[PDB]
Design an enzyme around this catalytic site. Structure first.
Site, PDB file in Angstrom:
ATOM      1  N   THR A 103      -0.373  -3.124  -0.200  1.00 18.78           N
ATOM      2  CA  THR A 103      -1.533  -3.473  -0.972  1.00 18.78           C
ATOM      3  C   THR A 103      -1.499  -3.122  -2.356  1.00 18.78           C
ATOM      4  OG1 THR A 103      -3.945  -2.594  -1.222  1.00 18.78           O
ATOM      5  CG2 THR A 103      -2.094  -1.080  -0.373  1.00 18.78           C
ATOM      6  N   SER A 104      -2.245  -3.774  -3.242  1.00 19.23           N
ATOM      7  CA  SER A 104      -2.496  -3.632  -4.592  1.00 19.23           C
ATOM      8  C   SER A 104      -2.307  -2.157  -4.804  1.00 19.23           C
ATOM      9  CB  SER A 104      -3.252  -4.443  -5.411  1.00 19.23           C
ATOM     10  OG  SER A 104      -3.414  -4.250  -6.654  1.00 19.23           O
ATOM     11  N   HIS A 140       5.483   1.292  -4.480  1.00 20.59           N
ATOM     12  CA  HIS A 140       5.782   1.580  -3.138  1.00 20.59           C
ATOM     13  C   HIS A 140       7.107   2.332  -2.501  1.00 20.59           C
ATOM     14  CE1 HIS A 140       4.867   2.485   1.376  1.00 20.59           C
ATOM     15  NE2 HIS A 140       5.705   1.494   1.755  1.00 20.59           N
ATOM     16  N   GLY A 141       7.230   3.084  -1.432  1.00 19.07           N
ATOM     17  CA  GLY A 141       8.417   3.449  -1.118  1.00 19.07           C
ATOM     18  C   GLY A 141       8.621   4.129   0.139  1.00 19.07           C
ATOM     19  N   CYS A 166       5.809   6.617  -2.048  1.00 17.54           N
ATOM     20  CA  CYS A 166       5.815   7.295  -1.031  1.00 17.54           C
ATOM     21  C   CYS A 166       7.502   7.506  -0.469  1.00 17.54           C
ATOM     22  CB  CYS A 166       5.024   6.891   0.199  1.00 17.54           C
ATOM     23  SG  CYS A 166       3.409   6.573  -0.199  1.00 17.54           S
TER      24      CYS A 166
END
Lengths: 5, 92, 141, 92, 139, 5
Positions: free
Chosen positions: E28-29, E87-88, E129
């Site tokens: 997601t954005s 993100h991660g 994350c």
């Protein structure tokens, strides 16, 4: 003398 | 008024993630040798993170492996401080 | 509040797990030098006014049971908690004398929600163990 | 020689294995706190102690608000990973 | 003992701000991240870093950028800062089009591979994350 | 609105 763990 | 269940932990690792850690058969491990020396010298004066940073520098600069096996000779080590602490820690 | 309260009646426990001799079935070498470490740590934390408990050559089962028991003690009058692990290891793993145990299984006993008498108090884990098999060749400077 | 892994610091927003939280309007909890502590303390405190204030601020001043009960009322602790060998001051 | 931070320049502060991800990622954005990047740019400007903001980079563009930065001459710089906003997963950051090992990014700056930063602090700030656990907290 | 990364 030096060793690894 | 909650806190994370993972808060207020500190993990003082002898070595970086993925690496061997080194131990001298007569004098003990480089990391524990250095940690005890810096706690002895500095626990009455320095915050624990600064003590552990001095441990990092001592291990990084004063130790180098000596081995008859060339594969394991002349190697270096950096410890790895992992803090989820929320306050400063003084042992006095 | 920017510094942990360290003036409880007791500084706390310092649990030292010193694994030197491993079951030959594991293939792991004897950790010559670790008795010197363990005695150095005992003296160091003694002078810091910790109640030091040295345990030697524990199986993975005995490590988990020790940690469980210690986490269920009443630490209300103690400022902090220290655990020192001296053994072989891999990333995320410390070895008992007879096999591996996840570090996260050990530290989870002291989670803020699982050891209430240590909630808000510093919980220090000092780990002398390998984290893999990489070697640092260093750089001359 | 020094270790090739020496003199790194990894300031992670969250503990190993965990989600990290972000507010669609104010930004991530960790970056909000990091910028605020650097603004308040870069001329006063060593970097590791600044990051310890960031840990406390994330741990105590934030809690998730979600319409999904599964994600509601959750907490976060950042994770400081230091292979540094010296103290770091942004002031003279 | 403390790092020498009176070189002529404090150094670079690289900010990689990934907000929009290819639909192949199913990701997601990241609303709010523009606020983060602008906050970081101003914060490090006040600390006298040379800030470079980059936006919406693929995993290849991240690797490329880091390689290029790492081959610059950092001789007159006190330190290096890299901020990653994305993100991660554990050990991983996401480019717009897929994951990248964080070790591949940081290895460019190892003391033997970036000699003009040997002995100088290399700071990586990572907002991403590291898995999918949730911390329920304790009263 | 709070969201995870």
């Amino acid at each position: 003398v030096d060793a690894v763990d | 008024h909650k806190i994370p269940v993972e808060a207020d932990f500190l993990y003082a690792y002898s070595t970086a993630p993925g690496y061997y850690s080194w131990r001298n058969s007569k004098d003990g491990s480089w990391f524990i040798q250095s940690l005890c020396a810096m706690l002895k010298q500095y626990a009455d004066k320095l915050e624990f993170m600064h003590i552990l940073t001095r441990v990092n520098r001592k291990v990084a600069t004063e130790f180098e492996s000596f081995s008859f096996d060339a594969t394991f000779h002349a190697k270096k080590q950096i410890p790895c401080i992992v803090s989820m602490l929320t306050k400063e820690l003084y042992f006095y | 509040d920017n510094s942990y309260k360290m003036d409880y009646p007791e500084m706390g426990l310092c649990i030292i797990i010193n694994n030197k001799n491993f079951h030959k079935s594991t293939g792991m070498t004897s950790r010559s030098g670790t008795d010197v470490d363990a005695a150095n740590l005992r003296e160091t934390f003694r002078n810091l006014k910790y109640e030091v408990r040295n345990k030697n050559d524990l199986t993975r089962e005995e490590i988990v049971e020790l940690m469980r028991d210690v986490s269920k003690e009443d630490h209300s009058k103690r400022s902090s908690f220290v655990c020192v692990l001296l053994s072989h290891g891999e990333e995320g793993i410390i070895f008992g004398t007879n096999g591996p145990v996840d570090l996260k299984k050990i530290t989870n006993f002291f989670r803020g929600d699982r050891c209430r008498s240590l909630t808000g108090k510093p919980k220090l884990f000092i780990i002398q163990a390998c984290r893999g098999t990489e070697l640092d060749c260093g750089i001359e400077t």
